[PDB]
UniProtKB/Swiss-Prot annotation, chains A, B:
The gene is NT5E. The lineage of its organism: Eukaryota, Metazoa, Chordata, Craniata, Vertebrata. Disulfide bonds join C26-C32, C328-C333, C340-C359, C448-C451. It is found in: Cell membrane. The record marks H93, D96 as: Transition state stabilizer. This is 5'-nucleotidase. It comes from Homo sapiens (Human).
Length: 521, 521
């Protein structure tokens, strides 16, 4: 019997340096976690101890911190090569800077194979990207070979900017012929490594004949066997076992996000590549694991270029700016109220009509909290992690019916850590989750524009309201198809980080609170 | 039979120039009201038409606009002499600048008798103020004489700064011997002119034998017979008839406030001074009445010194700043939310503990609205009328029990246009007016200080909270005795107008709304 050790990371999101426990900028260095230097110490320790080791990434290394704003993927290719990753699957955020933002910094500079079987290149692009990413790779591991098939979220054209020359096929339809090709090459050990979320990973384990292990990403799934070591609540045991349609037990693994944990799974295979057993758990990369000095000195060299983004203080916060998913995707979060107050302030600074009183913001668009214990200081860097996408805060004209539909969509699948949960400004919404989806909004009061003194009045279906929202939502992003389809007017506004930055500078000291903007019945 | 015409003003409050309909600074001159120039045209017209005329003031000429901030009462003595007032009764605001602020500008410069029978001077002051104000005056009117007895609110030591050398006696106890003295002088026509409010005026008409007419002030009572000409709702017919204990019908009159109306009452007396009948109504001093050119040119001369208080713009409002009594004494008003946000902002600008999240503000302390149609401009003058008293915004430490008592007091006599109604910041209060007084607060949630993210939690009786409030409330003003008696700590803060001014300058453009801080069940 032959034992393989799979070490996996996913949704790291430019978290190259060690972070606070909430994955925001490290301040109190003694209690910091993750980062590539720490991950390198743990990986090295496992390589010294285990004979057959694979270090894999299931996508979304791109986007999240000033590391990616400045280096545009050169930091990813450099440090992923430094850690000696054996393979990576393409994620949706790898396309955020177009195909060009993927090809030049990453595909051309990685010393490891970058995979995706369901991505087909066509037209002019076909010749330009050919062989820069592969559907599968056969990797020698000790005296054995292990086949790795890659996959990327089929919904990527709506999540990113991959362009019109890439076709995103159904994962299962595209993976089965590639697995069948590995089987003809007599590769009997097969890992499906990809980026579509835990729900699709379970479908790949059930339906794709020949896959032994599924290593996923995109849904930031925390899986654990026993008592977890930190604040993350497990969504199931590690590994998650799926029984395939052909009757084989298939472990499905995921390792949360932000490089806080290193996934770790041991598979005992027999001579014919049948999985005998599997055990593991994600490894919390805390303070106990010391950062590698060589990687850390290299991280510090690259850090010089970034320091001029933290030299200038925009203002102060005397309160924790809760930009976490556990807060901003489930209820009113003060980071969400702050950003919506900044949007309304930027639009009301230059103004019955002409005015704009309301704001809506997808909770999943807020990508990091900001801590108040660092002397209170807010820099362009702390703000760069909250709002990393470089989008705009647009003005839209919506019928009350359209706004009520967007609010119904906001909680249609409440309890899935779905980022469509809306943060608001100039709106008082009450939800009753005991009611059937599509009828959960029990109260929707909005701030009048056509009134001398502003006050909250019930939303009228036949009335038309002006709403400030991300360009992402206006384009039907996060399943807000009703906004794109039913809007009556759409104007482009200022860059997201600049709107929030000018506001923080004006206010000097900020203290946003949870005020009852969103309530539950 | 002999007919007397009584023209009366009360609670003018430094409204020397014509004002908007809400009694704030005149902008659209075509639809402006009141002012001394307009009042002079109407009074002159009545003097040309009627043989026996008395022009009286029932108090509170002092405090309200930049006219009083700058001239400290010299404008009152000058323009009241110009209009040829025959008498004035002392009001509580005439003592706001101490006895010295009353003696030097007004008592020493008025060419008319200034009256109060229930104010007794003692100790060192007795010799200094002797004869500068009188208990009564006998005025020749045509071939007849009319006696005028004055009175001032017994509660003045708590409302103002009259000092420890003036005794404020019971109105009825002090008025009866002065009326009896006029009766021995065979004065058969007697007017009681004073400043204690409509409720006390009715008691004087009922109890003081020999008073024929009561001309009052202090409660800003609007009395009208028929259909009123403006937005003011009558509190009863004009005149209000009180049947005395000795069986005589006694008219009681009051003419609202801010010089918007001129009270006008005709009394037909018989040969023995018995009131036969009385009819009248307040005269709305609107645009139809033209301003006297001589008084207006004199008003413009004095206006030069004031212009450097309007030359500098503090910021802009895009919304009407509702500082009216009809709003701020009955429900949440946006002027109240603004001032409470300015108080919390001034105290949080330099800060679990040390912080202050809550604000309370007596609604009656907000003395004027600000209009947004004047290009949006907010000047030191517009702000001077909102906050004319020159008080401070103090920090106090209160038990939850004390705060609940202050909120119970806030609505104990709801529906009387009582200024104790509280405006708030960092507090969510719900009242149920159908409940018995002392038990009307059904919900009282406050913003936590001892929490990383601020949020609204129920008030705990056994807990201690930090509240920013006017120095007036800390001293038990407006019947908030529980604040003065039960507070655990009291620190003096910055001047009220400066706190609000620095905030408006920081914000640049303001838009406070009615947000659900105060609700009714
Ligand atoms: O890491 P992911 O692959 O995104 C999976 P997740 O559970 O961590 O985050 C999902 C949430 O994030 C929201 N979201 C993602 N990208 C964007 C985004 N920009 C991405 C982008 C799109 C097109 C071109 C370039 C960049 N803008 C906004 Cl406002 N919201 C976004 C939105 F997609 C959702 O609420
Ligand atoms: O014109 P008035 O004689 O006052 C009768 P009104 O029905 O028009 O106003 C009553 C309201 O006004 C409130 N109030 C009055 N004076 C003050 C005041 N300053 C007066 C003062 C007191 C002592 C010395 C000097 C000035 N400060 C504050 Cl915050 N609130 C006040 C307080 F008294 C009440 O809520
Ligand atoms: Ca196998
Ligand atoms: Ca008489
Ligand atoms: Zn991701
Ligand atoms: Zn993803
Ligand atoms: Zn008054
Ligand atoms: Zn008064």
């Amino acid at each position: 019997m032959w034992e393989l050790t799979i070490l996996h990371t996913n949704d790291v999101h430019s978290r190259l340096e060690q972070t606070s426990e909430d994955s925001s900028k490290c301040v109190d260095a003694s209690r910091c976690m993750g980062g590539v230097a720490r991950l390198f110490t743990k990986v090295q320790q496992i390589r010294r101890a285990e004979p057959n080791v694979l270090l894999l990434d299931a996508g979304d290394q791109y986007q999240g911190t000033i590391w990616f704003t400045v280096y545009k993927g050169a930091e990813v290719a450099h440090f992923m090569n430094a850690l000696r990753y054996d393979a990576m699957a393409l994620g949706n955020h790898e396309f955020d800077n177009g195909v060009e933002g993927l090809i030049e910094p990453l595909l051309k500079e990685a010393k490891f194979p970058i995979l995706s079987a369901n991505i087909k290149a066509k037209g002019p692009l076909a010749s330009q990207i050919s062989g820069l990413y592969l559907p599968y790779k056969v990797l020698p591991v000790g005296d054995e070979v292990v086949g790795i098939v890659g996959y990327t979220s089929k919904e990527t054209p709506f999540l990113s900017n991959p362009g019109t020359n890439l076709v995103f096929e159904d994962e299962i339809t595209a993976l089965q012929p590639e697995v069948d090709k590995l089987k003809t090459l007599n590769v009997n050990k097969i890992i499906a490594l990809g980026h579509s979320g835990f729900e699709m990973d379970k479908l790949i384990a059930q339906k794709v004949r020949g896959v032994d292990v599924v290593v996923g990403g995109h849904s930031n799934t925390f899986l654990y066997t026993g008592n977890p070591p930190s604040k993350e609540v497990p969504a199931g045991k590690y590994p998650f076992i799926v029984t395939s349609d052909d009757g084989r037990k298939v472990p499905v693994v995921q390792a949360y996000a932000f490089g806080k944990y290193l996934g770790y799974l041991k598979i005992e295979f027999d001579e014919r590549g049948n999985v005998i057993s599997s055990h593991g758990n994600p490894i919390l990369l805390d303070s106990s694991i010391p950062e590698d000095p060589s990687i850390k000195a290299d991280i510090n060299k690259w850090r010089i270029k970034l320091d001029d983004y933290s030299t200038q203080e925009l203002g102060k916060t005397i309160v924790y700016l809760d930009g976490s998913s556990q807060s901003c995707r489930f209820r009113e979060c003060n980071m969400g109220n702050l950003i919506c107050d900044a949007m309304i302030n930027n639009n009301l600074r230059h103004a019955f009509w002409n005015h704009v009183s309301m704001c809506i913001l997808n909770g999943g668009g807020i990508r990091s909290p900001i801590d108040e214990r660092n002397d209170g200081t807010i820099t362009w860097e702390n703000l760069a992690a909250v709002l990393p996408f470089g989008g705009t805060f647009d003005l839209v004209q919506l019928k009350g019916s359209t706004l009520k539909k967007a609010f119904e969509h906001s909680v249609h699948r409440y309890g899935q850590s779905t980022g469509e949960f809306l943060q608001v400004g100039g709106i008082h919404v009450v939800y009753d989750l005991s009611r059937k989806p599509g009828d959960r909004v029990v109260k929707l009061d909005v701030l009048c524009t056509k009134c001398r003194v502003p006050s909250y009045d019930p939303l009228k279906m036949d009335e038309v309201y002006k709403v400030i929202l991300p360009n992402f939502l206006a384009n039907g992003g996060d399943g807000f198809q009703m906004i794109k389809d039913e809007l009556l007017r759409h104007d482009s506004g200022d860059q997201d980080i600049n709107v929030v930055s000018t506001y923080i500078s004006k206010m000097k000291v900020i203290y946003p609170a949870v005020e009852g903007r969103i309530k539950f019945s």
